[PDB]
Amino acid sequence: GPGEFFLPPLPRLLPAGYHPDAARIEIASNGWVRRMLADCFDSEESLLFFLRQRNGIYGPLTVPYAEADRAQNIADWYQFVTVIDSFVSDEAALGADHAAAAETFAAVVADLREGGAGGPAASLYGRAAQDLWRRIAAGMSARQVDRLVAALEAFLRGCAEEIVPHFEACMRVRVDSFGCEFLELLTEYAAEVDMSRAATEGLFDEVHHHGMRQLILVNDLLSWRKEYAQMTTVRVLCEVEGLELQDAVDRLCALVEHHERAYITARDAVLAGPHGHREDVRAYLSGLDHLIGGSQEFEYLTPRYFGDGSVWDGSTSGWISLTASVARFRDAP
Amino acid sequence: GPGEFFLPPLPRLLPAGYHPDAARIEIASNGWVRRMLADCFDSEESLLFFLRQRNGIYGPLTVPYAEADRAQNIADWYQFVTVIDSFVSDEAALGADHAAAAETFAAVVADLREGGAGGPAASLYGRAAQDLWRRIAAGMSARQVDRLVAALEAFLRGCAEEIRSKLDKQVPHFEACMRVRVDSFGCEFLELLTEYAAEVDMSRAATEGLFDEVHHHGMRQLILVNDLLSWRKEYAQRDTMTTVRVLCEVEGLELQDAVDRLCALVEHHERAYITARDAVLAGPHGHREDVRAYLSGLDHLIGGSQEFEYLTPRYFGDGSVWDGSTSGWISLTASVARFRDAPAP
Ligand code: NA
Ligand code: NA
Ligand code: NA
């Protein structure tokens, strides 16, 4: 096996800012995870393992421009989806199997839209979902709440089902599963805009295609240690195309740059076009800029990817152990 | 011995603010610790144990009003002082007889005194101290630089007295404990660094004793809160210089009685700090922008130090993650601790 690969400097063209309250939001998010989601963990050990991933600072890194309340709401949302994704591992815990998922999660979310706790199916996470719905729905248009309903249903269905021929079919499945519709809706929420109409008309089809593909590729690169040990572009290149790891990494880093520059081109085309003068469109596009820059800053930071025990030292390029329990970028092999 | 104690709600009357770049300053401060101090630790794994304590967020929690560069300088200083404190506090690293202790300690003293010298340092502590001195002394008046020299000397005198208290197996009476800890806690450092962060020079006012009451009560508040939040980690260790040990072993109090007494004392000194501060603010210097900036700086030092001490795994155990709770039952025996609303049955 390789045991060690080199991650070169990535373009990092887009703003990566921290919310002015990022450190405090991470702690208050951690507090909310204990209060609302403790029962999803089989012990204090498992909860703290999760809290050590610092998932609570993702929100403030993606929406550094947002009002503190909305930044807290998004930080708690992302911890919530990560807990349910990673730690709610039983059809009993989630409230449905793959068979029952559709009509079950339709009724859970129907109940949440009404201000309830999503009923017996949602027993270990419905108080959590209710608290987030209360906070977030209040600052959303009714169209946005329709979209949140569909987004949360798909997410829980996606979870129930979880219990390639080529690279592009990998990209298609990574895009369908990354939660892009959530990210897009929450970007609108943070920026206090409603892009519901412009988005159905396809104004953002190109910026979303490149934006989300950049997010996914950066994520596949920085999550490769975690995934190697457990559906990802790195695995497709190595196994389906038979590339050496370093060649796969080099290919994916160049692909990050392709989609990053193409995102900027496509964003600039909307800014130059007949909706580009609109302030809400500008605010949304700045939102996506900070989501893309901030997600990558977050992905360097998290012990979810560098191993429980790791503490980021700010290094972003160099040699990294594929296998070691705890990793960091070293300036030599 | 008791297995737990109850920490009642403390007054928490003073502002605990985070620097707007706090998260980022912590990471960069972790980077400085690896670049300058990696070789102070026995391994990568002991370096990570130290980095997991989040000592890098102390700076941004105590000078949230400062410019980012000065906040970074203070963040790095506090991490460095925490390393020095853990080395001199460690009988194995230092020596557990006078002779061996004194030789090791003399090397630490000589290394840190290289900080403000003209020739390059050879030691790990010397190069770290030189780096921090060059960054900080650049933002200081000549009088503040002399005071920085005196602050290091005060800190080292205090460390020497804490070391001797272990060697001689002697718990000080409360007033001798507080008198040592004003040195060992680095109060002169914190005062000067608070002027530096606020970009003021209080050298003249301090010489005239404008802040004697403000300092007396504010520093006592800081030391007492630190003693309460550090007890979990200090309780099994021996002859350490903490008022919890003074009240238990010198004055014969049961742990919970000692804790309750020290919480009453935190509130005494915290209210006396606010009264003393308000007197300066109402007095013939109280309109001065620099005086007001300094006292606002001490408010944030006092509030932020307490916030930091609740969050750090240095106190709540490696692997702990603060949930924001500030009062309740705390285990002395658990490998990780947090405040609970019931005792262990
Ligand atoms: Na902050
Ligand atoms: Na996980
Ligand atoms: Na690192």
Numbering used by the authors:
A (entry chain B): 31 to 193, 201 to 267, 271 to 373
B (entry chain A): 31 to 375
What does the study report here?
Diterpene synthase VenA is responsible for assembling venezuelaene A with a unique 5-5-6-7 tetracyclic skeleton from geranylgeranyl pyrophosphate. VenA also demonstrates substrate promiscuity by accepting geranyl pyrophosphate and farnesyl pyrophosphate as alternative substrates. A promiscuous DTS VenA containing an atypical 115DSFVSD120 motif was characterized to catalyze the unique cyclization of geranylgeranyl pyrophosphate (GGPP, C20), giving rise to 1. The monomer of VenA holds a typical isoprenoid synthase α-fold comprised of twelve core α-helices and four additional short α-helices.
To provide structural basis for the substrate promiscuity and unique cyclization mode of VenA, we first sought to crystallize VenA in its substrate-free form. However, we did not obtain any crystals of the wild-type VenA (VenAWT) and supposed that the N-terminal flexible loop region (1-15 aa) might prevent the protein crystallization. Thus, the truncated form VenAΔ1-15 with the N-terminal fifteen amino acids removed was expressed and purified. Of note, the in vitro enzymatic assays indicated this modification did not affect the activity of VenA (we use “VenA” to stand for “VenAΔ1-15” unless otherwise specified). In the crystal structure, VenA is dimeric, which is consistent with the result of size exclusion chromatographic analysis, indicating that VenA forms a homodimer in solution as well. Helices B2, C, G1, G2, H, J, and α4 form the active site cavity, and helices A, B1, and C-terminal loop contribute to the dimer interface with a buried area of 2350.5 Å2. Similar to dimeric CotB2 and SVS-A2, the two monomers are organized in an antiparallel arrangement and each active site points away from the dimer interface. The PPi-Mg2+-bound and apo forms of VenA show slightly different conformations with a Cα root-mean-square deviation (RMSD) value of 0.327 Å. The obvious movements were found in C and H helices, which resulted from the binding of metal ions and PPi group by the catalytic motifs, including the atypical Asp-rich motif (115DSFVSD120) located on C-helix and NSE motif (256NDLLSWRKE264) on H-helix. The side chain of Tyr108 forms hydrogen bonds with the guanidine group of Arg344 in the apo form, but is rotated to the opposite direction in the holo form.
